[PDB]
Amino acid sequence: AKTHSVETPYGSVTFTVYGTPKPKRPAILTYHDVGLNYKSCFQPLFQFEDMQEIIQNFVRVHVDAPGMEEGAPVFPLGYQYPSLDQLADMIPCVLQYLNFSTIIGVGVGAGAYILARYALNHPDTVEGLVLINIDPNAKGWMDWAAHKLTGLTSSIPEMILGHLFSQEELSGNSELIQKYRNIITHAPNLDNIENYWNSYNNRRDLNFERGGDITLRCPVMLVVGDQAPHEDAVVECNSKLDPTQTSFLKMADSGGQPQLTQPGKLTEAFKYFLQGMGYMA
Incomplete structure (x- = not known):
């Protein structure tokens, strides 16, 4: 459990490394x-006992977006947070500092977009992606108007929650939803999170074109809850990527954060996904 920190052209990024290496495996x-x-976001999944079993054989690098780490300083007023692109650009710095040369990326939402942009810039450093709730397209103008409309009546935490969880789950108001409403609404770093939320909303197209110049050349597992906020964007994305190397796990009963509600199944899917690329898992 070693925490590290590196500098990049866009300020610094913090990450945490688990496991002793395996020089002949990518890092997760x-x-x-x-x-x-x-x-x-990820600790419950990675500490699930089945997932422990599988990753025994890999080093893990868990990144916290700038400003998001436990105990981070609140950026100053008028601070100028990196765009999703610039966040993807901070990854070589991490990899360099550690001397890893290849990864299997696991992201959620903005994190999924980030790792996918990273893959486009450095495809030979990426052996595979697990992309949960990816929305690979800029916000359309209808979405923007709808977004600003909602914004007149939802606080920002409410809006961030609406990105992470489905509306059903929100009224459902389970124990987890309460927890998360709390982590987010009372976060000491709430202003930092807001900037990241902006970066996210302002993202550009990835332009995955099936059999075009702009695709992913590594195997990809897409993941999303049924009837969750990003199902359509994930579905659409599946239609732009190479079907030979892309599976699509749409999970019944998982909601917006399948990795928190279905660690069991997602862990199993991860096992097959690793087998899929020829790693005994």
Whole structure:
């Protein structure tokens, strides 16, 4: 459990490394969604006993977007947070500092977009992506107007929650939804999270074109809850990527954060996905 920190052209990024290496395996690098950090986005999944079993054989690098780590300083007023693109550009710095040369990326939401942009810039450093709730397109003008409309009546935490969880789940108001409403609404770093939320909303097209110049050349597992906020964007994305190397796990009963509600199944899917690329898992 070693924490590290590196400098990049866009300020610094913090990450945490687990396991002792395996020089002949990629590293599993995770990047989390808006409103969360490694600890609230991915820790329950990576500490699930079955997932422990499988990753025994890999080094893990868990990244916290700038400003998101436990105990981060609040950026100053008029601070100028990196765009999703610029966040993807901070990854070589991490990899360099560690001397890893290849990864399997696991992201959620913004984290998924980030790792996918990273893959486009450095395809030979990426052996595979697990992309949960990816929305690979800029916000359309209808979405923007709808977004600003909602914004007149939802606080920002409410809006971030609406990105992470489905509306059903929100009224459902389960124990987890309460927890998360709390982590997000009372986050000491709430202003930091807001900037990331902006970066996210302002993202550009990835332009995946099936059999075009702009695709992913590594195997990809897409993941999304049924009837969750990003199902359509994920479905659409599946239609733009190479079918030979892209599976699509749409999970019944998982909601917006399948990795928090279905660690069991997602862990199993991860096992097959690794087998899929020829790693005994």
